Design a protein around this ligand. Sequence first.
Ligand code: I3P
Lengths: 79, 49
Amino acid sequence: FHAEQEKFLTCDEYKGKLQVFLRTTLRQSATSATSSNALWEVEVVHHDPCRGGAGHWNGLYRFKHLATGNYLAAEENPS
Amino acid sequence: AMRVTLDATGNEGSWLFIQPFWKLRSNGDNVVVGDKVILNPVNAGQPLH
Ligand SMILES: O=P(O)(O)O[C@@H]1[C@H](O)[C@H](O)[C@@H](OP(=O)(O)O)[C@H](OP(=O)(O)O)[C@H]1O
């Protein structure tokens, strides 16, 4: 949840591809705008693939879209 | 606007609420050094500009 804009990070298909965006809502309570497409699973990086456990501030994390299964990442901007 | 000055003795006009300028800060949270805040006079009601 991005507080400054009071928006949830959501991934959904627009034309033919999945894109990550912040969804605008008309609800008075921004936190009440809950959607299934805005659900992410937190993965803690561990040398053991099958090991999870509690995270640390100095650790590494991955974010996986629960609905689609893809992973959050960054790529080159066309502009 | 309303006048802002310095008074040796002071009065009720020196009362200033320290309000969070960032949405990530909420009332009752401890103020962290280096943060940006709003100084709102209690009686005047208009933040320092
Ligand atoms: O106030 P009402 O008449 O109940 O209407 C609700 C709300 O005002 C929005 O229309 C919508 O929120 P979004 O803008 O986030 O779609 C929400 O849908 P939801 O049930 O899908 O949250 C509605 O239920």
